[PDB]
Design a protein around this ligand. Structure first.
Ligand SMILES: Nc1ncnc2c1ncn2[C@@H]1O[C@@H](CSCCNC[C@@H]2Cc3ccc([N+](=O)[O-])cc3CN2)[C@@H](O)[C@H]1O
Ligand SMILES: Nc1ncnc2c1ncn2[C@@H]1O[C@@H](CSCCNC[C@@H]2Cc3ccc([N+](=O)[O-])cc3CN2)[C@@H](O)[C@H]1O
Lengths: 265, 255
């Protein structure tokens, strides 16, 4: 078990946040004007799920935030305490730049505007970002391969009412078995009856983050569903987006994207 | 007097904060955008061609209009305003940033449209920017490139701001009304009970008008008033740039 993990940790030492941001969150993949694009689909899954009112509580943990905040734009009106996490210091620093409203931070304002647009409440994007910054109460190291991903007696309020995780588990797991165990490990962080929102890449074997070319376990929708069931979830929603050819740039070999809403039993 | 009008001062006074803060939905900017959006959302204001009367250096007043009219003419009395418009239309250097207004129009309209697509459509549909003088019986002169008669007019904060008194305001309205097809629509926005405003070195005289006065003026020009509403200016938006008391929005139909 330890070998595959050592390979993952080593490969991530070359991960370049800015290149990763450019590849995935600037145009063309970061084009929010095309409703058929992947950015709008992700934001829609999240906004629609939170719009049900069924996913709420006091505390939320984002698992493997990397250098991004988009996955929390709709969530942040429903949780007063948000923990963001990442394995890499360089990503935690990138989140820090953004938290401090630095220029030189990545500009999420197009995503914030798009979230305001689809949430349909007339909120301005500046109020949305102010609220996300207020509700993020800590940014913590994490390793999903450890039985306690946050370490012993972490700062984070546990158990959490909800988890969010985008493009983390399949990107740090050498094989399906590692992915299943990682899912079990983060599932310990979640209250029974709590909710997990999982976004990830389907049938991907690599992606680029600068010099770093990371190896990814290719997973199918069926594999994700079965993993959720095995970890003790009821699957409420599991959607697939098929990556259009024009978005099939050379930054990865992804075939689609999945969104799962699961409730822990 | 208008010869000392400074577009950048005017923009700063009226379209930068506090008056240009769009975050609070009780502000004047959001109220104006809502009047315009709700009106066009009815479907009753439609056609091929539209003229914006006295555009000055602003485009917000056409953000909801532009998806209902394929040919748009913008107008102003002053070359310096016409150049400021040109800088924004051609995406030139130092153009005013209207993106907050574009974004808010998209939010209000509720169609999920992105603000870059809205600006793109506005820029595509504005075919020309022309001189205009509403004091002339033919405000656009004879044989102007503008298709006439227009199917719709929009005019925000022009007639009361260029008229010394109610009689002049009425005549200016009669004048622009000749540009409008019978059965066509006028969307008129303006200041209530204002007597002056500043634009840098220019101090401009305004005729103070009431809601009743505007209604009466419309009827006299031959319009049926479909809608007329008032925004009362809150104290935190009462700055030193004018003495405005309120803003009116009128939707009128020529008959
Ligand atoms: N042991 C660990 N525990 C927790 N997190 C860890 C661990 N090791 C690395 N990490 C952390 O997880 C990393 C996750 S970044 C996302 C990687 N996903 C792969 C790739 C990216 C991507 C992104 C967006 C889209 N899209 O279309 O919107 C598609 C794709 C294609 N897939 C990173 O922050 C790393 O630092
Ligand atoms: N003879 C003419 N014919 C046509 N246009 C002409 C003529 N002479 C001058 N012009 C043209 O008309 C002008 C219109 S802009 C200034 C209007 N002044 C009213 C002032 C501005 C304002 C704006 C917004 C708000 N608000 O709270 O939303 C409040 C206020 C307060 N009132 C200007 O572009 C000028 O160039």
């Amino acid at each position: 078990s330890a070998p595959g993990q050592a390979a993952v940790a080593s490969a991530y030492q070359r991960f370049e946040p800015r290149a990763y941001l450019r590849n995935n969150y600037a145009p063309p993949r970061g084009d929010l004007c095309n409703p058929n694009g992947v950015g709008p689909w992700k934001l829609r899954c999240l906004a629609q799920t939170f719009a049900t009112g069924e996913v709420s509580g006091r505390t939320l943990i984002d698992i493997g935030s990397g250098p991004t905040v988009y996955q929390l734009l709709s969530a942040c009106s429903h949780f007063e305490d948000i923990t963001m996490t990442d394995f890499l210091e360089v990503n935690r620093q990138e989140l820090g730049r953004w938290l401090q409203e630095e220029p030189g931070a990545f500009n999420w304002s197009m995503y914030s505007q798009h979230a305001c647009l689809i949430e349909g409440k007339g909120e301005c994007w500046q109020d949305k970002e102010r609220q996300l910054r207020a509700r993020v109460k800590r940014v913590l190291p994490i390793d999903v391969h450890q039985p306690q991903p946050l370490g012993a007696g972490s700062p984070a309020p546990l158990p959490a009412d909800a988890l969010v995780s985008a493009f983390c588990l399949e990107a740090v797991s050498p094989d399906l078995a590692s992915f299943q165990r990682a899912l079990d490990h983060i599932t310990t962080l979640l209250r029974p009856g709590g909710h997990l929102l999982l976004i990830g890449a389907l049938e991907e074997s690599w992606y680029l983050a600068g010099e770093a070319r990371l190896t990814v376990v290719p997973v199918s929708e069926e594999e994700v569903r079965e993993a959720l069931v095995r970890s003790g979830y009821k699957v409420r929603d599991l959607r697939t987006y098929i990556m259009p050819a024009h978005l099939q740039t050379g930054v990865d070999d992804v075939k689609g994207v999945f969104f799962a809403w699961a409730q822990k039993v």
